[PDB]
Amino acid sequence: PSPHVIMSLEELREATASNRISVIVFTLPDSKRSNEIKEKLRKLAEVFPDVDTYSVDTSTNPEAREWYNITSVPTFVIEKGGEPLGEVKGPDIDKLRVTLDELLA
Amino acid sequence: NVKPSPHVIMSLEELREATASNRISVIVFTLPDSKRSNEIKEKLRKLAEVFPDVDTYSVDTSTNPEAREWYNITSVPTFVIEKGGEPLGEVKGPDIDKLRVTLDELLARKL
Amino acid sequence: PSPHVIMSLEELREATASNRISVIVFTLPDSKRSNEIKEKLRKLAEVFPDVDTYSVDTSTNPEAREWYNITSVPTFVIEKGGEPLGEVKGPDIDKLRVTLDELLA
Numbered sequence: 350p351s352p353h354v355i356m357s358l359e360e361l362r363e364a365t366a367s368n369r370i371s372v373i374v375f376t377l378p379d380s381k382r383s384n385e386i387k388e389k390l391r392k393l394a395e396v397f398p399d400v401d402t403y404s405v406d407t408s409t410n411p412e413a414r415e416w417y418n419i420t421s422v423p424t425f426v427i428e429k430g431g432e433p434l435g436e437v438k439g440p441d442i443d444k445l446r447v448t449l450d451e452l453l454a
Numbered sequence: 455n456v457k458p459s460p461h462v463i464m465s466l467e468e469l470r471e472a473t474a475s476n477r478i479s480v481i482v483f484t485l486p487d488s489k490r491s492n493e494i495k496e497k498l499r500k501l502a503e504v505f506p507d508v509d510t511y512s513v514d515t516s517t518n519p520e521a522r523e524w525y526n527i528t529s530v531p532t533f534v535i536e537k538g539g540e541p542l543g544e545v546k547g548p549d550i551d552k553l554r555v556t557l558d559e560l561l562a563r564k565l
Numbered sequence: 566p567s568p569h570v571i572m573s574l575e576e577l578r579e580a581t582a583s584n585r586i587s588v589i590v591f592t593l594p595d596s597k598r599s600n601e602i603k604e605k606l607r608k609l610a611e612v613f614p615d616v617d618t619y620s621v622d623t624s625t626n627p628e629a630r631e632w633y634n635i636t637s638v639p640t641f642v643i644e645k646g647g648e649p650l651g652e653v654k655g656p657d658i659d660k661l662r663v664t665l666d667e668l669l670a
Contacts, residue, residue, distance in 0.1 A: 356662065357608040363503050363659070366455045409611045431455030504659045558655025562637035563593065 350391050352402035358413040364403060365428035372449065373403040373426045375419045382440060386423050389442045397449060427452065459502035460495060460510040466520045472511060473536040480557065481511040481534045483527045490548040494531060497550045501557070508557070535560060567607050568618035574628040580619060581644035586668075588661070589619040589642045591635045598656070602639045605658045613665060643668065 352374065355361045365371045374390050376383040387404050394402045407414040407422055417426055417433075425445050427435040434452055437445040460482060463469045473479045482498055484491060495512070502510045515522040515530055525534055525541075533553045535543040542560050545553045568590060571577045581587045590606050592599040603620055610618045623630040623638060633642055636654075641661045643651040651664045 354612045356612045357605070359605075360659070360662070366503050368455075406611075409608075504657075554657070554660065555654070558653070558657045558660070559637060560655075561657075562639065562655040563598075564637050 351387055352391050352394070352404040355403050355405045355410065355413065358410065358416055361403065361405065361410075361413050362416075362431070364401070366431045367401070368430045370397070370400045370434075370449075370452070371403060371428040372400055372445070373405055373417075373428065375405045375407050375414065375417070375422050375424045375426070377422045378406050378408055380422070383423070386440050386442070390425075390445075393442060393446060397453075400449070456502050457509065460498040460512040463511050463513045463518070463521065465518070466524055469511065469513065469521050470524075470539070472509070474539050475509070476538050478505075478508045478542070478557075478560070479511060479536045480508060480553070481513055481525075481536065482531055483513045483515050483522060483525070483534070484531045485516055486514060488531070488548075490531065494548060494550065497553075501550075501554060505557070566610075568603055568610075568620040571619050571621045571626065571629070574626065574632055577619065577621065577626075577629055578647070580617070582647045583617070584646050586613070586616045586650075586665075587619060587644040588616055588665070589621060589633075589644065591621045591623050591630065591633065591640045591642070592638050594622050594624055599639070602656055602658070606641075609658065609662060609665075613669075616665070 361373070372390065374386060376386065390402050394400050405413050407419060421438060423440050425437040426433060427449060435448050437448055463472070469481070480498065480501070482494055484494060498510045498512070502508060513521050515527060529546060531548050533545040534541060535557060543556050545556050577589065588606065590602060592602060606618050610616050621629050623635055639656055641653040642649055643665065650668055653661045653664060
């Protein structure tokens with residue numbers, strides 16, 4: 350069970366415009382736990398009710414990498430209603446979980 | 455981001471100034487709590503998210519009889535598609551799959 | 566790789582006979598709406614591995630226009646093994662993505 354794979358900068362901007370919480374992981378494809386971070390991200394979505402998860406392969410989405418100013422991968426971005434609410438740099442799923450919960454408080 | 459969508463309309467005067475834009479407006483004419491209503495709102499909402507130049511509106515006919523009369527609404531729910539104050543299409547019934555299809559065909563170029 | 570430009574109905578029927586999934590956009594020639602939908606189709610192909618994309622100019626392919634019952638542009642047709650699986654009439658790339666995801670489930 351995976352996060353929704355983003356095809357373009359435009360699909361991504363339409364997604365984050367929802368007022369549900371969007372959590373987006375930016376990755377590189379060949380990256381051996383790129384698949385592990387993706388499934389952990391979706392697994393983590395089960396315990397968060399109003400949260401949708403997305404994955405962006407930066408090697409095929411340079412426009413989205415630039416638009417969200419992604420300077421290292423993996424990076425997580427938290428969005429709501431087109432507003433960025435937080436960012437977690439690195440494959441640290443527990444810091445993302447903590448950050449996400451602070452927003453919901 | 456997007457307008458709170460669909461935007462709930464209070465009066466005919468507000469509705470006419472909204473649709474006078476050269477953007478495409480989609481208006482759902484409904485009754486207060488019909489067993490589709492929550493799906494009609496969430497659909498209209500997603501359609502505003504996926505369509506950039508499209509604004510979506512909701513008109514409760516039970517509190518807006520002048521808007522019901524003005525647009526000649528004969529049953530609810532009904533969808534009206536407008537641009538520059540002129541009607542481009544209408545979808546009768548709670549068939550919002552029809553609504554998206556109809557809207558796509560209006561954005562297309564015939565032939 | 567931008568969608569492959571189709572020369573004829575015969576070429577198109579031979580392409581769609583593959584057991585890979587073919588997605589075909591029917592457009593009118595070099596209008597900047599047309600070039601814009603073609604790039605959208607290319608980006609969508611990157612998130613689907615077993616998908617090939619094609620472009621058909623209805624003004625130079627009247628046989629294919631008639632054969633696929635094309636009455637407005639752009640229209641997308643999804644095929645697999647010579648069988649059409651879905652159709653999207655109009656410039657709704659998001660509904661095409663949704664239709665494709667439901668087919669692969």
